[PDB]
Amino acid sequence: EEEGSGGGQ
Amino acid sequence: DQPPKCDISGKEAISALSRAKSKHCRQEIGETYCRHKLGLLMPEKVTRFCPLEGKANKNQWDEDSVEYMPANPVRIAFVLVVHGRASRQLQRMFKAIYHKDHFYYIHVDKRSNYLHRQVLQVSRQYSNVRVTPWRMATIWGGASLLSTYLQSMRDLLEMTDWPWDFFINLSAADYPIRTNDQLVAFLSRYRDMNFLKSHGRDNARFIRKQGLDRLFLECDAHMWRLGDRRIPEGIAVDGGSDWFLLNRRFVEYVTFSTDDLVTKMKQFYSYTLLPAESFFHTVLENSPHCDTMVDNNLRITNWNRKLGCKCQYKHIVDWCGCSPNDFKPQDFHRFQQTARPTFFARKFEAVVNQEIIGQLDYYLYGNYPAGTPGLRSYWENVYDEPDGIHSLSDVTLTLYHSFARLGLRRAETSLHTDGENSCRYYPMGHPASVHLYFLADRFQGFLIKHHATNLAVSKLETLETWVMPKKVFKIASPGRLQFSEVGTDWDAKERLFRNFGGLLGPMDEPVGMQKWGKGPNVTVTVIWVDPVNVIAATYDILIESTAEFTHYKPPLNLPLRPGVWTVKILHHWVPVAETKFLVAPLTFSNRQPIKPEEALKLHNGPLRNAYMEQSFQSLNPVLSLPINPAQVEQARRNAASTGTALEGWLDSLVGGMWTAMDICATGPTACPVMQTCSQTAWSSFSPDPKSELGAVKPDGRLR
Ligand code: NA
């Protein structure tokens, strides 16, 4: 249930 | 051309200029880079207006709290940002959330013209429903999503005939998990609060993984990474989910304020990846309204990064992204939790699983009357005439034509007479529409609407045909294998092929997939066989104890020989299972009837007379796959055919892998054995009340 859609470069 | 105004030496910027395709895009890249190089693009320090020392964090939640009736109920402005083809699922959700006292403002992706035409019919029926006249191409992660929200906020504030109190954004994959009455009761009590959810982890790691310290530019429907930048001093940066609820006072502040915080943050977030995931958090926490924040967006998001983080957006943005999974029936119990208040959830997809949607809708608003049709069915339009045959590909155009002819031959053979056959047809023009057809979450095939002349009375008729693929997966006596399939556009998150029909042409690159049950680790062999028994590839796979799905794309020289291919799975030479797929020859080139020289070039197998470097001729005798010299020459002859001869070759292939289940007329017909499409159970013209929108009821609802 962690939020945020970025997943690094 | 034209040289830049600055020396450009950053690796990221050079890689972007090299990959960019349009002159306008390359110029914009150079202009952005130069300005940042001189320090004139990004702000370096920003004023903080919040009197608090840190964050607010406001509230204690009891289920019975939301069962009162407000004296002054809030009126909600729903902003729907939608894209794709799932108009009937959107209609169902719109039905669940509609009330005459709220307002609905719908932005349809500029690239989704079919959906926009369907939405327009909704806005024309109801006075509290409008569509944005402007339309952006809102790519995943693009900066334009924030521009979309900020412009819709400005528009809504200037609609003086719409006195709304809250702003709520929804996509076509959202659905309510509580009634409208409970939503209104809850928000009527907390009308001065703002609902945003933060990441819930380490803030430094959030910034890096979101790429907030990187400079991005949206151009040509792509997010180009152009280099590094500093987080400005003097403010707390925060973020999380870009699904939220904001009250009118805060929307007014964001839209019209000219103070240091709002001005510089709009500039900063014009060049930011996933800007809506942190723009509103950063402004609010540093603004005069900071003490109104609730760390809860009232949503349940089905995150499963084990499956949803596969860097599947690498072709759209210069970064790796994730996205939430679709709910399944086993997840229903999660919608009944009481830990925190929640009113919406995502994502739902009817082509992935409709059962859970039905469970949720009936749980909130009760069953439909007994005898209601279409409750377990789903129709989704994948081609609509107004968009033109150039919006299709040569593959789909060729095969949609073939499916139509398969239906016309069904009509002729289904009438048993010794007189004139009044069910003989001649096809005319191109398909008018195509639909995917699902029943009880099982794919049923395609529905093709098309025009044809009834040759007995010499009159044009409009028909719809249902074609269904023949079963081809075959297991053999020997096990962990459960299923095997070949297709394209494999969705690693949902574990399915998004090319639902498995439609393939000679220039396609097929993917083989296997599905496994529990058990010990095992190793198997995979064989690809072309229509004249040439073995194209062989390889072994390890099936680990925990494996559920495996897939692999063999490197095969193109074009592929047309016909029925076979894929075999063995275990130490012991047969396990097999499947088949169709590489169809094309009757169209650039949407035109294919010409002899391009037919021969395209339908005679790969250039090097071989699919890979290493050969597998040593295997044909072992597996009993003899190569027949007659079939090889016949395949050569087929490769040079056009017109009728080519049409007869294609239609005999399609007929061997597809079945015309039924065919109906939309209007009057002379064929005595054909139903009217509206009277069928399967037609896209048949009643579908769960997605149909009628008159507003006395209680102000449509559901
Ligand atoms: Na309207």
Author numbering:
A (entry chain B): 211 to 219
B (entry chain A): 252 to 310, 312 to 730, 735 to 959
Relevant lines from the article:
The first enzyme in the pathway, peptide O-xylosyltransferase (XT, EC 2.4.2.26), catalyzes the transfer of xylose from uridine diphosphate (UDP)-α-D-xylose onto serine and thus determines the site(s) of GAG attachment on the core protein. XT1 and XT2 are type II transmembrane proteins consisting of a short amino-terminal region facing the cytosol, a single transmembrane helix, a stem region required for Golgi localization (Schön et al., 2006), a catalytic GT-A domain (Lairson et al., 2008, Müller et al., 2006), and a unique C-terminal domain of unknown function, termed “Xylo_C” in the Pfam database (Finn et al., 2008). XT1 has a two-lobed structure, with one lobe comprising the catalytic GT-A domain and the other comprising the Xylo_C domain. To better understand the initial step of GAG biosynthesis, we have determined crystal structures of human XT1 complexed with UDP-xylose and various PG-derived acceptor peptides.
To obtain defined complexes, we used crystal soaking to replace the co-purified ligand with dodecapeptides derived from the PGs bikunin and syndecan 1. Peptides 1 and its variants (2 to 7) are derived from bikunin. Superposition of the binary complex with active peptide 1 and the ternary complex with inactive peptide 2 allowed us to construct a model of the Michaelis complex. In this model, the serine OH group is perfectly positioned for nucleophilic attack on the UDP-xylose C1 carbon atom. When the XT1 complex with peptide 1 is compared with the C2GnT-L complex with the acceptor Gal-β1,3-GalNAc (Pak et al., 2006), the attacking oxygen atoms occupy the same position. Thus, we believe that we have crystallized a catalytically competent conformation of XT1. Indeed, when we soaked XT1 crystals with UDP-xylose and catalytically active peptide 1, the electron density for the xylose group disappeared, presumably due to GT activity within the crystal (not shown). From our structures, we estimate that at least four residues either side of the serine need to be in an extended conformation to fit into the active-site cleft of XT1.
